[PDB]
Paper text:
In Escherichia coli, the main RND transporter is AcrB, part of the AcrAB-TolC complex. This secondary efflux pump facilitates efflux by using the electrochemical proton gradient and besides being the main cause of MDR when overexpressed, its physiological function in bacterial cells is to export naturally occurring toxic compounds, such as bile salts. The physiologically active form of AcrB is a homotrimer consisting of three protomers, each representing one step in the drug-extrusion cycle. This functionally rotating mechanism is shown by each of the three monomers in the asymmetrical crystal structure of AcrB: access, binding and extrusion.
To check the role of the hoisting-loop segment, 860TGMSYQERLSGNQ872 located at the N-terminal end of TM8, we created a shortened (truncated) hoisting-loop mutant by deleting the three amino acids Leu868, Asn871 and Gln872 (one turn of the α-helix). In order to address these questions, we solved the crystal structure of the hoisting-loop-truncated mutant AcrB at 3.0Å. In general, the structure is almost identical to wild-type AcrB (RMSD 0.70, 0.67 and 0.78Å for access, binding and extrusion monomers, respectively). Surprisingly, the structure shows that the entrance of CH1 to the proximal binding pocket is still completely open in the access and binding monomers, similar to wild-type AcrB. The shortened loop flexibly retains the same length between Cβ5 and TM8 as in wild-type during the export cycle by unwinding a part of the α-helix. Now, the random coil region is 864YQERSGAP871 in the access and binding monomers of the truncated mutant. Although the channel is completely open in the binding monomer, in the extrusion monomer, we found that the loop was tightened and stretched compared to wild-type AcrB. In contrast to wild-type AcrB, the loop was not an α-helix extending the top of TM8, but a stretched coil from the top of TM8 to the bottom of PC2. The rest of the protein domains were unchanged compared to wild-type AcrB, indicating that the truncated loop was still able to act as a gate for CH1, facilitating efflux for certain compounds by opening the channel completely, although the truncation of the loop did cause a significant tightening of the loop. It also shows that this significantly moving region of AcrB is very flexible and that the deletion of three residues (about one turn of the α-helix) does not limit the ability of movement of the porter-region sub-domains, nor the energy transduction from the TM-domain to the porter-domain.
Numbering used by the authors:
A (entry chain B), C (entry chain C): 751 to 800
B (entry chain A): 551 to 900
D (entry chain A): 451 to 500
E (entry chain A): 251 to 400
F (entry chain A): 51 to 200
G (entry chain C): 101 to 350
H (entry chain B): 51 to 100
The structure:
Amino acid sequence: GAAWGGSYVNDFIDRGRVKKVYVMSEAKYRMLPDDIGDWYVRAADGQMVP
Amino acid sequence: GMAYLFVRLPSSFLPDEDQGVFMTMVQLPAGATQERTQKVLNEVTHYYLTKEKNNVESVFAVNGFGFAGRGQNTGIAFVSLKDWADRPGEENKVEAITMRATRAFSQIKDAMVFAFNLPAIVELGTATGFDFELIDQAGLGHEKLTQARNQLLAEAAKHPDMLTSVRPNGLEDTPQFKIDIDQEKAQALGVSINDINTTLGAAWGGSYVNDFIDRGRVKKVYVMSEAKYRMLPDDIGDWYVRAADGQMVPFSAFSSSRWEYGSPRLERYNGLPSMEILGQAAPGKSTGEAMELMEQLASKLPTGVGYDWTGMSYQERSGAPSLYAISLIVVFLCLAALYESWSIPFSVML
Amino acid sequence: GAAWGGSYVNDFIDRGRVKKVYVMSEAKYRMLPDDIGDWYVRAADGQMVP
Amino acid sequence: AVFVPMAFFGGSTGAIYRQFSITIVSAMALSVLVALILTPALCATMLKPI
Amino acid sequence: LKVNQDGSRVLLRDVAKIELGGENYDIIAEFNGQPASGLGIKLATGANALDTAAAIRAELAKMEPFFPSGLKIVYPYDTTPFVKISIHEVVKTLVEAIILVFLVMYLFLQNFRATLIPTIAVPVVLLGTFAVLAAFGFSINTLTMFGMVL
Amino acid sequence: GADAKTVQDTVTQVIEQNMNGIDNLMYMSSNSDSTGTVQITLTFESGTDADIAQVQVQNKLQLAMPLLPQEVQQQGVSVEKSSSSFLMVVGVINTDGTMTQEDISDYVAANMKDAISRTSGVGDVQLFGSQYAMRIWMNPNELNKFQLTP
Amino acid sequence: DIAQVQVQNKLQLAMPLLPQEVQQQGVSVEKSSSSFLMVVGVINTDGTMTQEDISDYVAANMKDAISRTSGVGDVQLFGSQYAMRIWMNPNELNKFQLTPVDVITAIKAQNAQVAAGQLGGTPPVKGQQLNASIIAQTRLTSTEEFGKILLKVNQDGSRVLLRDVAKIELGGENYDIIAEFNGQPASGLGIKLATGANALDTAAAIRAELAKMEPFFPSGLKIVYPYDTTPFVKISIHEVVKTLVEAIIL
Amino acid sequence: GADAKTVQDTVTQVIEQNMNGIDNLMYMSSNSDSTGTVQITLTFESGTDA
């Protein structure tokens, strides 16, 4: 979800003014279904499953 | 003669009418159970479909709802009547029907059951009636105030001449199954209180987990113990909680259990604990006389207990027959100023 | 935060009335700049770090 | 005078009397206007000569 | 719930019974004995009872076509009817009171043309009264109707 | 699942303590049930704007919501301006045995109740029964057997 | 009113762009006044209550009532209400390897009100004869009880209670305001007026209410009035009505 | 990151079934969509103070 849609994380202050802070994925890594295979996620093991 | 009858005539507000409808209330004693109050609701519904079947059309009975507030010991029954036309006679109007029924239910085996009429303007009151809040004016707590309240009732019974049916509106305290978690034993054995309290609460209390969709409508999802394991004090030990050991600990290995009384309906008035009391003035004697007496009995209650009038009995210092006084004087001024006189008025005004 | 500023933890009932519960450092230990060195925080390896 | 006073019996009951009175006084205000148009002119041009 | 390390599964159904059932089970209602449910409806502060009750039975009629065969609405307790008939039995009594005025100008005048200057006069100031109750913003109620009768 | 005193000392009193500065307020009163339910009633001086009162109360209520337990929050808190007497009770039954009581009552809650309760002039709608929920009915033996808690 | 609405209708726009930290606490929208209508001050006559005890008394048995009394806007408490005040010593915390983190966790754990359902609950098994609430943990109620909060059991079996790492007591929620009446410890309500209301009829409501509470005061508590604005009104009416009968004689 | 059905079933329904005891409302409507947003719009009687 964060990678492919984007998370709102929290705020910060830019030039005396409060503003959002999203993290998405870099566009290139979330365009087409083969892109899914790029992503991995930690297990109990502490390895990186895909 | 006109001044005599006037002073010997009662003073109601609006007559209670027959509206096609009325309600019956059922309160069973606390401890009671859903299935036991349904017994009473049946015998209520029965009376109306067999005995008063010339007058009744529908009884809509609700177990669990109450005019009082919810709970497994209360009920209500809404009652619809045949048309006014189709039941001629005064013994076939609400007044009578409610009386008969209330009398009839009077011998229901241990359950307050009371048929009564809608009263013209509900918020404005029952003519001879008063509504009284006793109050924990500082610190006392439920028990000390239950007692204060008892004192007050006991002594208002000792004046049947002035007061009648002085009674609490609330509920009497009932037994309760207290459970202590012994914190040491738990923290010894490896069980958090978080898992303990969640397990107890979810099983016996029920627990709203999250939503799901049933035929396109979002609806709640609940987890709770099947009824079998949630009925008796013993069933507590059916439940196990997993320590970090990996090991399922009995509930009974970190916990006492004991019976204790407490209220099932804690009531409060303007911000602090209270107990509502209803009653009427005695037949003949007026309400301001009963209110005066009730304030006086109130005066001699223990320390920290106060009172307040509320509802129908809250402030009536308004209206007055001083605007009857102006009326005839402004009628005077205008008969005078019609007849260009001051004796020609007294002609008609008399 | 809880030490120099306090922290509202949860409630209790004082003589029949819900009121607040606070944790905070005792005065002695939040008066001087030097007092920051009084507090230790505990690393995840079980030992206390000033 | 015999009515409008009760239209100010205010508080609690007030609006029960306020409704009754204002009705009866409005009904009299209209009664004169009837007696000063329709009751005269009609008598003239309805009840038989005598 | 878990995969037993031997290979097995613990599905939720193996530790609990699972059915649709109430959010709650405190409330249970019958209608002349027959199992039922319904909506108890309380009126909003200041709302009109008669309008609101019609609004409801409009909206209920919107729904009846789409009910599922077997379901039937029933009307066990209604405040409105009496409010509506109370007013009408008065508005009858007001026309009767005209009809007994008209006939005691015949043991008292005897021109049909003259027994009519009264019997017209009453209706014209009544219907004007209603217009003024309308001006001040009053309603037609048991007190305003007994106004007219008096 | 909360008992009377638990309701009182975690919902009722926190709400009560924030009913401050609310015009033409005559008195306030509240019940806290064994049934886990609290209702507080604020009664206002006569001819008070009932829409404004609500707004005014709900305002202060809002400042207190953060302090109620998640569970009381999640069940939905409400502020209504109603008449305490039922205007009517609409009944619903089943003619042909194709719907149980539980089912009739779910149908009402989930096809009737919402429409009715938006129909202007309707302060409160009491459902005599319950909307369905998904029920997980835990067995403690079966749970323990597999070394599990709720 | 119709301007509190509009303000609250426009504050909805800003509402979510403000931190969740802010959205807890809450945002008020009060029709505000500024000056104090009056200040009711409370003092103790016989040494049986301190400045902090009086303050807590005023907050816990007078401020609530008066803030709902007929006419009143904001109330200001000159002092604070008690709280359970766990005053933690950083050294003793080290001695047992503990942190304010451990203390708050314990506190949430062991001072808690827990809903535990009931015996004979709905839906039941048919034939059930009893139904009663199951009561579990309740909120603590006393300093002894908070003292006895277990934090950890040491290796030797010996236990580290909360009274081992902290001084426990009733105290204020803040210690910021401190008030004095002719040099003498007081608390007080600083009453504000509610945006147009009969200040004259308001103060006689405040005063009439204060009398309702006077008989339930503890020994030694005495209401005093260091700052009423309404006597000036009462008099200023007499001294223009004094003119009225002056002028109509002249 | 949401899609009409996510948006409808977690947000739109929940709000809708929750708009009650609002005075003088004629009808209301919702457009839960796949930009991941919803708008619900309630329309009142002519004359309703907005």
